[PDB]
């Protein structure tokens, strides 16, 4: 059977987020055999991830939902409220829909979009993207065992 996995990515810091989405989309598709299928959906910001995962999840056409974004402190406004709301949101959604939802919504201790700062998280996100895909495979598999 072909399991559909949806990726809901924010477009803020698209540059870095996409490094996670591509890495993720590779581990998922590359284990090719029509096993999994990755549909990617655009979302303005992290705050827009929960409701989108829910609507997607409620179609019953997906075995899992990945939420991904980079939620940082830009120096002017505080980012914790939104970060908190999104992480708690995806938890509420999956418990609600019974559809697993993995979190690739990251918040670093520091991010000044400096040349060095940008380089780093741009490369570490591919790492996290790979992590998420292998965790996705594992959770679905761990569910058959129930």
């Amino acid at each position: 059977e072909t399991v559909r996995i949806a990726v809901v990515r924010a477009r803020w810091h698209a540059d870095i987020v996409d490094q996670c989405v591509s890495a993720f989309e590779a581990e998922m598709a590359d284990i090719g055999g029509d096993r999994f299928a990755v549909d990617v959906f655009d979302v303005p910001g992290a705050y827009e991830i929960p409701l989108h995962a829910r609507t997607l999840a409620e179609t019953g056409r997906y075995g899992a939902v990945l939420g991904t974004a980079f939620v940082v402190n830009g120096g002017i406004y505080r980012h914790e409220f939104v970060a908190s709301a999104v992480i708690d949101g995806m938890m509420n959604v999956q418990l609600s829909t019974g559809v697993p939802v993995l979190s690739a919504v990251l918040t670093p201790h520091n991010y000044h979009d400096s040349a060095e700062h940008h380089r780093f998280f741009f490369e570490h996100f591919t790492v996290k993207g790979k992590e998420a895909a292998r965790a996705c495979v594992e959770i679905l598999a761990a569910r058959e065992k129930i």
Copy 2:
């Protein structure tokens, strides 16, 4: 196709808040294709945004809602609770009604009601107000992409 967007704006720091609401409507007009009509509703403070956003969402007349407020650390009482309750409340509202609720409820690191602070944000809210418009047009259309 015609779409109605309701804006729920608080009146604390109306001054600054309104800069976002108007920047919101203008942007909405440009990148909208004349598809959107916008109704604005006045609410005392940020804490009054979730319940109002929900009541509006339930009418079924709107496509999305934009809550916008300036919740700051006034230096006398703590603002996190209210700030959190409001951002948590709006997430809560869109999940239960299925109606998108965008946040323009901002809390800065520092706002001491000085000429510099007041001016800065009076200016920046125009930037956010525009960001909110794009977010609104983007998610609505994104949702049209879900079969």
Copy 3:
């Protein structure tokens, strides 16, 4: 046609809290008076507000409730967990009842129950109390505008 407002006031630092309450009724009467009526109920502390607000809310007899308390850090136990539950609580109550719940539940950055401190908030609560009255009238008048 009279519209009632319920005021759930905690009894901790009653001195300071009541100044918010009588500043609420006076302002309420002054800006609306004739059109509104205010009933006041006592609760041990702020933690007991959400439930009371919900009960008063579910009687259908009220157009809105005002939650008001003074939740401080007394230097022994942490207060953030309670204050947090009361604020999310009132949001939780108003969202499922549909009845507006205004918040006058305040937590100061610092309050050591000293003459100057006590004196400061005793005075300031009447100011917040007057802010609550306007807020209450406005949200009720604002809802009146929604073409529900």
Copy 4:
């Protein structure tokens, strides 16, 4: 008729959490004679309080549930997420069942297991226990005034 109150006490720092329970029962009988009865139930830790309370509340046997526990920072792991999910839990339970749930789940700013620290709180939880009795008696009296 006699009103039943369920005390759900935690077994962590049992020694301290009990000065509260013991004081709560004393004051309860002190200001209610035969009007109330107290049933004490044991629970492993603070995190088990919410479900137990919701379960006890749902038997319709109790007029209120008192949750009590000492959730300190052991200096090894972080205690906030627990303290927080428990105060939120007790609020979640009371709003859903409709039964008052008072909090005696205190978190100090500091507790290092020093003899001094233990002595202080061993004593102070008695103060809290007494406060919990008044709260419990009053809240219930307060709901009666509500022409539900």
Copy 5:
């Protein structure tokens, strides 16, 4: 009759999480005799525990579920949002299903994966496993008295 306990253990820092798991099974079978039986389930991260616990809880085969993971600040991203939502998630899962969910989802003040830390927790997690065991046997007994 026999009561079955389900364990949901995250694989992050698995090496440490497993000292607690094996100390739980050991302590359980010890203080409970042939009264209980334990079933272990593997989850990628701490964030997958709530939904797994709810799903396991909804099979009506377990009298309780134990979630166990090590959620730490790795010095790159903020960890409190996930921690926060796991502890809330389990509390939410137990309140809705009625099945107790004991928590062994620990978060230390400091963990730098040095030699000192890694050893301290590899060891202390055994202590926690015993504690979770007694907690489990105790709460189920406390409920029988209602």
Copy 6:
């Protein structure tokens, strides 16, 4: 006989700072009565106090020196360093010159240029001045006891 006390005040938040000074002068007179004489000197801000105070103490013309300023977090720059450099600074000057230097350089937890904050501290400062006046008289009387 009379004793000279020198007051070095910053001109930042002069409004508030002067309530401490006038209060200091009042208390100085009420409990000291013609025994003490107060000379006031202006300085741009708190950072200039240590040197001015030292220079004064070195004239050997004052029994003691008071330093007073309102050092706050205006919400844009960090105030700690300066407040700290000045509290240690005054310590530095009195330990080396041998002349007592009393501190009325206060830093509030919060101050936001809101009526509430301004009024509170404008009012409270006369209290701090009163204390410094008493501390001033007391420290000198004590030094007297050191045989």
Copy 7:
């Protein structure tokens, strides 16, 4: 040949402070008796302690000096700068003078002058006073055993 120890106590919260001073004297006479003598000196607040410790020290009549005070965050202004400047200043004094300076200048994590707090430190300062007593005797002996 009697050894005199000079205790310099602040007067803020004198209530609690005097408990440390009295316990210090008791213990000091218990494990010493006729070997040491205690002279107490009153000072306005903690900030005035370092200079008084120095003056006293420089008379060469004291084998050591004990500066004790209660320095709490009263909720309005910040108390770290003054504590810091007092604890550091005493260190400055003993290093430049060679006269040991023991500290009983405590700053609690939390103090609201409520019934319970007051009682807690009113008692505890007794413990501290006896500790300072032992520390005082030991240090002088440890130095006695150095070329």
Copy 8:
């Protein structure tokens, strides 16, 4: 002698964020001229970073050619290393200098709460620094005036 004399003011400006720092420098000279005019003269000295200001301010100060020295730098938190220790050492160091040399050293070394090298951040401080420069000037003129009264 009587005052028909010129007082020299030396400015020790850091070069990190030269852009922003410079705005404080020009506004200082302008203000200075505006109120001081002919009774003061300003010499500007470049320095690598804020940490180098104290020793430089001290060498200048000890030549005796200046009535006051103004140290100016922009010590920010780049998000990688902590800037507190340096900022604190530079602020304490100057105080150290002025007390030892006796020559007034005014501080224009600022550490903002949040600086993330962005358009608005940069623009905010590029503008605000002129405000701080004018303040530095009035402070410099006044402190010197105030001393003359002693």
Copy 9:
């Protein structure tokens, strides 16, 4: 040619502190022997270290002075003021007298008097003792290369 090192140890938490002292003496011999000799001096608490280190340095019999103590957060009073004064104090002392003053005055992020914490540091202090042994030897060697 026997260089003498003086150790100033606080008697507060004397138990945990002495594990650094003895570790220091063994490593010193293990890598010095004949070359250096250690002399131990007891002081009431940390705050008394600076003045003692000075007095010792000034006798001119020692090539280096080691200051050691455990300065923790007691949950009742703030400890930073005293720690800060001692680290600065020893620095102050070495720059004036010219005798190197090494630091084994440690402050743990968290230390509650419990068996777990007490054991950790009772054990970790020997590590610091050996580190301090090699530091002392190396600094004295490096100064000769000048």
Copy 10:
């Protein structure tokens, strides 16, 4: 005629500290070869830098001194006290001796000895070495202008 610069480098995280030293040397030779000579001295830890720099400064042999170290929070002890006494110390040293003392004693926000952290700072220190070089040349030239 040749001006000599002295470098006092700590040996903690030597691997990383040395990146700054070599980068420094290579830049010091690149922007003014022959005019400057760099002498490197080893010290155990950052806390040893002030005294060493002072002794090296007091010989009149050097036109300046560079202190370099990596002072991090290891999750057990607080590092603020040493970092501060070392940064204040070098300032205290250059004001008394008059000899310039540049600072390369860095303290990061987060360092957890791991693949990514060590990598990031290992390379970044090259950037900090070059920066210290320019500052060295520039400050000595700035002084000539007096």
